[PDB]
Structure formats: C-alpha cells, structure tokens
C-alpha cells in the first residue's frame, strides 16, 4: 500500500512495499505444489552452501 503523497516515486515506493511483503516471492512459491521432501532438500542445500561459503570465505593472497 502506497499513498501517492509525484507518481514516479510512488510506484517505486509501491514496488518496494510489495518486495517487502514477499508478495511476488509468495505467488511463485504457490504456483505449483512443492513436494515436502523437495522443500527440505532445497533448504538443506541452502544452509549447506551458505556455510560452505562463509567457511572458505574466512579462508579467504591471489597475487
């Protein structure tokens, strides 16, 4: 929700007011049924990648 208080701002403010309610995110989640197993598999690989990043990104000479 954005009360137009110029329009160009208001539509950008709108576009960021709906990012933040994860609206488009949510529609794309609920377009097709994610089977619960697949949901978890994604979530593990997410966590696993996130860690395996940070770990080696603390191990982060080059030249």
């Amino acid at each position: 929700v954005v009360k137009v208080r110029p329009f160009d701002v208001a539509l950008r403010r709108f576009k960021r007011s709906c990012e933040k309610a994860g609206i488009l995110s949510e529609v794309r989640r609920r377009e097709h049924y994610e089977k619960p197993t697949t949901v978890r598999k994604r979530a593990k690989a997410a966590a696993q990648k996130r860690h395996a990043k940070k770990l080696a990104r603390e191990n982060a000479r080059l030249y």
Binding site: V1, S17, K20, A21
Partner: protein
Amino acid sequence: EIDYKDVATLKNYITEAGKIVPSRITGTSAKYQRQLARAIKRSRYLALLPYTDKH
C-alpha cells in the same frame, strides 16, 4: 514479558502488512521470538492486531 494485550509492543514486531518480523531482523532471542509469535497470534484472534493489511 509479552502480553497478547500489549498491542503497542507487539506492533514493533509486526510489519506494515501485519506479518510477524523475523527474529533475525528484530534481534529477539529465540525464546522471546517464540513467545512474541504466540502473543501476536493471540492478539490477532482478539482483533487487537490484524492478520492481514487487507481484511
């Protein structure tokens, strides 16, 4: 010490859409976050908070 009646506090932990805010954002302790979420959800049932911005 979270009450389903303390709307004012609870409102610091809901978004404009009405959504419960992550504990990552707010910085709440897991234990507190759990108790918020419970209170917020009791508030919502007493129409002291809204479930959704739409309604």
